[PDB]
Design a protein around this ligand. Structure first.
Ligand SMILES: Nc1nc(Cl)c2ncn(Cc3cnc(-c4ccccc4)o3)c2n1
Length: 209
């Protein structure tokens, strides 16, 4: 079964701002997702120091960037700590409430959308370029789940029926029709060089066949 949920009110409001406000500097979404992956890799690496079995689901710690011009998707894959069902439905939204309110306040005071990561809600910058986001994720202590939202106030969670991940997270960006530049190998290279050239895990930009 597929379960459908309403976003926290502040988060639905934030998504509507992101999806609708005119802002040309959309490329910052990739830096934010890569930063999130780095944070998740940091966390499983840290936990493995006192419990090495936490890496039985996979010893490699890396980030992969996978464009698909055919599917019009850009996928960010990490082997980080992954997200639980409770993370997807409640916990990550709850911790984002105060940062979301503060961010939207700062936007009214003159801040820029590119500061979204400094408020801890950089995940939602995905909707600068994506009409729908699918998140496939697997935490050691939980099953593999698929989260999905096209904004509009709601999201779904279901147990994943795809191939097992071991552990980590795949963020699948279903790009807007006019945002296909983020499938170009040279555009992705430019963005990664510019924003996140100091990330401590191997980042591999897959080439299309
Ligand atoms: N890649 C990666 N991995 C891990 Cl474990 C993360 N934990 C937090 N974030 C950033 C984030 C902040 N809100 C979300 C979010 C994601 C899906 C559905 C609803 C909300 O994600 C992570 N990103």
């Amino acid at each position: 079964e597929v379960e459908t949920f309403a976003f926290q009110a502040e988060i639905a409001q934030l998504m509507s701002l992101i999806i609708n406000t005119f802002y040309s500097n959309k490329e910052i979404f990739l830096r934010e997702l890569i930063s999130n992956s780095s944070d998740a890799l940091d966390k499983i690496r840290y936990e493995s120091l006192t419990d090495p079995s936490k890496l039985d689901s996979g010893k490699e710690l890396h980030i992969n960037l996978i464009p698909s011009k055919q599917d019009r998707t850009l996928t960010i894959v990490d082997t980080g700590i992954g997200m639980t069902k409770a993370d997807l439905i409640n916990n990550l939204g709850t911790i984002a409430k105060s940062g979301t309110k503060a961010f939207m306040e700062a936007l009214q005071a003159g801040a820029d959308i590119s500061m979204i990561g400094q408020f801890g809600v950089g995940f939602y910058s995905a909707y600068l370029v994506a009409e729908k986001v699918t998140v496939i994720t697997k935490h050691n202590d939980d099953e593999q789940y698929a989260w999905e939202s096209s904004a509009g106030g709601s999201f779904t969670v279901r147990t994943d029926t795809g191939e097992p991940m071991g552990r980590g997270t795949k963020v699948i960006l279903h790009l807007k029709e006019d945002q296909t530049e983020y499938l170009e190998e040279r555009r992705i290279k430019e963005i990664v060089k510019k924003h996140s050239q100091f990330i401590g895990y191997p980042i591999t930009l897959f080439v299309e066949k």
